[PDB]
Amino acid sequence: EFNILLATDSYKVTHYKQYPPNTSKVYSYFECREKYEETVFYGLQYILNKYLKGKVVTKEKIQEAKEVYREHFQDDVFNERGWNYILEKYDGHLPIEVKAVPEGSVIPRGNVLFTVENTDPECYWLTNWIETILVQSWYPITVATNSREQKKILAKYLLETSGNLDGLEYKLHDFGYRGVSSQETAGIGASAHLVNFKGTDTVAGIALIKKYYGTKDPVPGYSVPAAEHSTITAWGKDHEKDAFEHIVTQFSSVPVSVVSDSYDIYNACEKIWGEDLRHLIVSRSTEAPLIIRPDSGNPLDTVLKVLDILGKKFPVTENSKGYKLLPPYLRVIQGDGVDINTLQEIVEGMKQKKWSIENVSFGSGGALLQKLTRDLLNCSFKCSYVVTNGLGVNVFKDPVADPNKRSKKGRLSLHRTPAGNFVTLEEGKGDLEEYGHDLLHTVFKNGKVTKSYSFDEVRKNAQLN
Amino acid sequence: EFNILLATDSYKVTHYKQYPPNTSKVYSYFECREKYEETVFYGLQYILNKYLKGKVVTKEKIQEAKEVYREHFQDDVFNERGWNYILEKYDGHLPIEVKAVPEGSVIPRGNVLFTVENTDPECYWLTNWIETILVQSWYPITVATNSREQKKILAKYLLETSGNLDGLEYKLHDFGYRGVSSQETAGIGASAHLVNFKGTDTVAGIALIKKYYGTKDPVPGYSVPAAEHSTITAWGKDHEKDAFEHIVTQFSSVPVSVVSDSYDIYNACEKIWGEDLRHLIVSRSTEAPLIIRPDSGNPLDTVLKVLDILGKKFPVTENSKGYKLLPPYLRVIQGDGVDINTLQEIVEGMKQKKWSIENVSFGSGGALLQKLTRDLLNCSFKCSYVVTNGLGVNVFKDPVADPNKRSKKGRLSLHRTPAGNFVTLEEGKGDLEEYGHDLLHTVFKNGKVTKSYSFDEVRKNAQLN
Numbered sequence: 023e024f025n026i027l028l029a030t031d032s033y034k035v036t037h038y039k040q041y042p043p044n045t046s047k048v049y050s051y052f053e054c055r056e057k058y059e060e061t062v063f064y065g066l067q068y069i070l071n072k073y074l075k076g077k078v079v080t081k082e083k084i085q086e087a088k089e090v091y092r093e094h095f096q097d098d099v100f101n102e103r104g105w106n107y108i109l110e111k112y113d114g115h116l117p118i119e120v121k122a123v124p125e126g127s128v129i130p131r132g133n134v135l136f137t138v139e140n141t142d143p144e145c146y147w148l149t150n151w152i153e154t155i156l157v158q159s160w161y162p163i164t165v166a167t168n169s170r171e172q173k174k175i176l177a178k179y180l181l182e183t184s185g186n187l188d189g190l191e192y193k194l195h196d197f198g199y200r201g202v203s204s205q206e207t208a209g210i211g212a213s214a215h216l217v218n219f220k221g222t223d224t225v226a227g228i229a230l231i232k233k234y235y236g237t238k239d240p241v242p243g244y245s246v247p248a249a250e251h252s253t254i255t256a257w258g259k260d261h262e263k264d265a266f267e268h269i270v271t272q273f274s275s276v277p278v279s280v281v282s283d284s285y286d287i288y289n290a291c292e293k294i295w296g297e298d299l300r301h302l303i304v305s306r307s308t309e310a311p312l313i314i315r316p317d318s319g320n321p322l323d324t325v326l327k328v329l330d331i332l333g334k335k336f337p338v339t340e341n342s343k344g345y346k347l348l349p350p351y352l353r354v355i356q357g358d359g360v361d362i363n364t365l366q367e368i369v370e371g372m373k374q375k376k377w378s379i380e381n382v383s384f385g386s387g388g389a390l391l392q393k394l395t396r397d398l399l400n401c402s403f404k405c406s407y408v409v410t411n412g413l414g415v416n417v418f419k420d421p422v423a424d425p426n427k428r429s430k431k432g433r434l435s436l437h438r439t440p441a442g443n444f445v446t447l448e449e450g451k452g453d454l455e456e457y458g459h460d461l462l463h464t465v466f467k468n469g470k471v472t473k474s475y476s477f478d479e480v481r482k483n484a485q486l487n
Numbered sequence: 488e489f490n491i492l493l494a495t496d497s498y499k500v501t502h503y504k505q506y507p508p509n510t511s512k513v514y515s516y517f518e519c520r521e522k523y524e525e526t527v528f529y530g531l532q533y534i535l536n537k538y539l540k541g542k543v544v545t546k547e548k549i550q551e552a553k554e555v556y557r558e559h560f561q562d563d564v565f566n567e568r569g570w571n572y573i574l575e576k577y578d579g580h581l582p583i584e585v586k587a588v589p590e591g592s593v594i595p596r597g598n599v600l601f602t603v604e605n606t607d608p609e610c611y612w613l614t615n616w617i618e619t620i621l622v623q624s625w626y627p628i629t630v631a632t633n634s635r636e637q638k639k640i641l642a643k644y645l646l647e648t649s650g651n652l653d654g655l656e657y658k659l660h661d662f663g664y665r666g667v668s669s670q671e672t673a674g675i676g677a678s679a680h681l682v683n684f685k686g687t688d689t690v691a692g693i694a695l696i697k698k699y700y701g702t703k704d705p706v707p708g709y710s711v712p713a714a715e716h717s718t719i720t721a722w723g724k725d726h727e728k729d730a731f732e733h734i735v736t737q738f739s740s741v742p743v744s745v746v747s748d749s750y751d752i753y754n755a756c757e758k759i760w761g762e763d764l765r766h767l768i769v770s771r772s773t774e775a776p777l778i779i780r781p782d783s784g785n786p787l788d789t790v791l792k793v794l795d796i797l798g799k800k801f802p803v804t805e806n807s808k809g810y811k812l813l814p815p816y817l818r819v820i821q822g823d824g825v826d827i828n829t830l831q832e833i834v835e836g837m838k839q840k841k842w843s844i845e846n847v848s849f850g851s852g853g854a855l856l857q858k859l860t861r862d863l864l865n866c867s868f869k870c871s872y873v874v875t876n877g878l879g880v881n882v883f884k885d886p887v888a889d890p891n892k893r894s895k896k897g898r899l900s901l902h903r904t905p906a907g908n909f910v911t912l913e914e915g916k917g918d919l920e921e922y923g924h925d926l927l928h929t930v931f932k933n934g935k936v937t938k939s940y941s942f943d944e945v946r947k948n949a950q951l952n
């Protein structure tokens with residue numbers, strides 16, 4: 023099915039011919055180059071298990087590569103020899119060593135996160151070949167990081183307005199399934215979000231977690247019964263009340279989310295929920311609340327006006343922090359216009375009008391799982407060290423016009439500092455042992471995963487202070 | 488392997504219970520809602536063939552869904568009955584009809600592009616079950632569209648500065664493989680780019696084309712031998728000239744791209760290429776030119792200073808439009824900081840300094856295939872028509888705070904206007920036959936692809952004026 027020989031930037035096919043003659047080692051590292059001051063390291067284990075481990079080279083896959091690349095370049099540039107070596111010598115197991123910080127670890131920017139080097143001098147070319155597939159770890163890293171930053175904002179404001187962080191892990195739902203570029207992207211994105219939260223509408227995210235990480239948590243992911251516009255609008259413009267009444271009665275004993283902005287969000291909250299069907303809401307259990315979903319207008323203005331309306335029609339309490347609280351059978355979900363920037367504006371506006379964050383949970387789609395790029399955290403793979411004619415050489419780029427594109431020199435290691443911070447030691451200075459043990463661990467060697475983490479370990483490592 | 492029962496927004500599991508009783512039909516449409524004034528319709532055929540066609544329901548997949556959703560909701564909310572019906576009645580073939588504009592069609596914004604309706608009254612729920620997976624067509628649509636807009640800019644400036652569009656389809660390369668969220672996303676993205684251009688470093692893009700569309704073109708995709716920083720830097724800081732000389736000699740008879748900004752782009756062009764190795768460049772064939780790749784600094788400023796340096800060291804001609812032309816053995820690739828916005832700035836700045844666009848080709852990665860979202864063209868799926876108690880009802884949303892989120896009413900059709908423009912007719916007004924035949928065709932019915940397009944047809948349909 024998958025052919026790792028095809029799974030590279032096609033130009034890398036020619037790179038074995040381009041390295042200095044008598045090169046026995048190519049050593050390369052991945053970092054989130056130097057606001058996202060710290061990144062969550064998550065997703066490498068998925069790639070290692072799915073694509074890189076075991077017998078990944080066959081006679082068929084070498085022949086497929088030869089044909090595919092011959093057409094692509096209109097020239098017989100693909101080299102079977104190096105792949106035939108790996109097939110014959112190691113039964114198609116990749117002779118590379120990958121070291122990495124533990125999955126879920128929170129590491130400041132500008133630090134070595136993983137390194138790759140060949141274990142056989144004949145496979146010097148292989149380190150660079152697998153750059154492309156390993157670099158795609160930027161996505162689960164960037165989703166996990168951006169999601170965790172949104173969790174920080176929710177943590178600050180939930181603690182301020184309620185005095186606790188009860189239910190924090192249910193405050194930001196993944197609605198991104200339709201808004202991402204592929205089914206595979208949806209799975210990886212959902213799992214990266216689930217490092218921080220439990221809410222997703224992509225069950226493939228939980229399947230990815232169970233298969234590639236594993237969990238002792240009986241409920242690692244969840245969702246709630248919810249309406250869409252179609253299940254309201256299908257009743258006709260004049261029968262919105264009938265749609266509401268049908269759905270809350272059909273889901274009387276469980277939580278139900280009901281989109282209320284089909285025609286007039288403010289009419290729906292004040293006249294339909296707040297008057298006509300009030301008796302069907304106030305009778306509902308604390309375990310089975312109505313969640314009103316606005317989905318249009320200015321996100322903050324809409325939330326404030328909805329809470330104002332519900333406050334006028336339902337009994338509002340004031341909690342011990344002096345913040346207004348809706349009854350336990352009634353809540354709101356803001357599933358429109360939420361990203362890292364707007365989330366901050368919304369909880370701040372809610373705090374200024376003395377509404378507890380426990381009143382409103384949040385959802386994000388494209389902004390959560392799609393509107394992220396490799397440049398967000400500057401995720402890149404760079405050659406730092408080579409052995410040529412048996413002599414180690416510390417290598418790096420340093421473009422005269424952009425110092426930010428300078429890469430690190432030589433053999434790298436990651437260390438805790440005395441004050442509890444992080445330092446990446448260059449030029450093999452880790453060997454001086456002036457800091458503790460290297461924080462990177464061998465996770466991959468000669469086609470085998472040597473060190474693995476449960477999703478429980480990932481979540482624990484990725485926790486907030 | 489893939490389970491379409493799991494491949495929905497998890498809340499849609501409950502929607503069969505939410506539609507009005509006695510609903511026999513759910514009819515829904517996809518549009519790029521109302522700068523991208525026109526969109527390329529591409530990628531639906533990939534989804535229909537990969538995920539939706541044939542026996543997609545089994546006893547095992549129904550049992551998997553029951554278990555997966557029971558945990559996800561902590562409640563037995565998944566309905567086996569509807570799926571057991573489809574299994575027993577249609578041998579697991581989906582009883583839906585999908586109509587769509589031809590693949591590669593260029594359609595203005597705010598027009599019906601495809602429609603979905605159930606063909607069996609028992610499967611009214613199925614239309615909106617498959618929303619999530621069909622909506623993911625936003626990505627190949629948005630990539631194809633954004634790529635075509637970049638082609639328009641290159642077309643304008645290439646014609647202006649050269650007098651022809653020779654090699655236009657090779658002017659923008661896909662470097663996006665590492666910069667996208669998954670391997671599947673890389674394939675789909677590359678194929679969407681290849682609607683407009685032939686340059687990609689993702690061979691999976693060509694494999695997707697051949698398998699899901701097919702082509703009579705012997706060379707639908709291509710790439711060129713190229714260096715990366717690693718194959719230059721590995722030689723050591725003092726041996727940049729040696730790396731250059733080795734690579735151009737190893738690729739003497741083919742085109743070779745050589746990244747030249749490792750240490751000092753301007754030193755490399757003036758002193759290394761322009762003096763030390765000049766004799767190895769000026770001897771090269773028109774079919775095997777050196778391509779210098781800057782990869783840092785202000786994109787426009789760097790390009791202009793590079794061309795100025797090469798102009799001072801190599802013979803420059805002036806073409807019949809009065810624009811400066813490098814010798815046929817020497818060209819430039821700007822593979823850094825290129826997107827729809829900057830591409831315009833670069834070719835404009837090149838034109839103002841009287842440099843032909845023939846001199847410089849372009850490459851884009853994340854900006855091409857990753858930094859795109861569903862909201863770019865406002866791609867959405869909406870229920871427009873239902874039959875309840877045997878009576879047709881025209882349905883729509885109309886949120887009071889956002890008129891732009893208003894959806895279309897009733898049975899839809901797409902028509903050419905007398906002046907050669909497009910109109911979407913609502914409320915079944917297509918039946919009046921004032922505007923000739925509906926442009927949408929049945930592409931899917933009862934688990935079978937009924938209408939298919941070659942990638943040759945897609946490319947022809949997606950052509951510039």
Ligand SMILES: O=C(NCc1ccc([C@@H]2O[C@H](COP(=O)(O)O)[C@@H](O)[C@H]2O)cc1)Nc1ccc(S(=O)(=O)c2ccccc2)cc1
Pocket residue numbers: 192193194195197201221245246248249250277279280311313315317353354355357358359383384385386387388498867868
């Ligand atoms: O309401 C739902 N899903 C439905 C849904 C459907 C669609 C959307 C939005 O609409 C967009 C789709 O529209 P277009 O296609 O773009 O036109 C989508 O991208 C997203 O932005 C949002 C939500 N889920 C849900 C989940 C958890 C909560 S809770 O955390 O409050 C809570 C948890 C547990 C117990 C009590 C409370 C509340 C609600």
Ligand SMILES: O=C(NCc1ccc([C@@H]2O[C@H](COP(=O)(O)O)[C@@H](O)[C@H]2O)cc1)Nc1ccc(S(=O)(=O)c2ccccc2)cc1
Pocket residue numbers: 033402403657658659660662663666686710711713714715742744745778780782818819820822823824848849850851852853
């Ligand atoms: O030069 C190459 N590929 C190599 C390459 C490698 C990397 C890059 C850039 O670097 C990024 C990766 O770096 P980081 O990981 O972010 O640090 C990547 O995203 C991209 O931005 C760009 C290019 N190919 C190539 C293709 C076609 C032309 S042509 O159209 O001029 C032409 C066509 C036909 C005959 C003659 C001429 C010229 C050159």
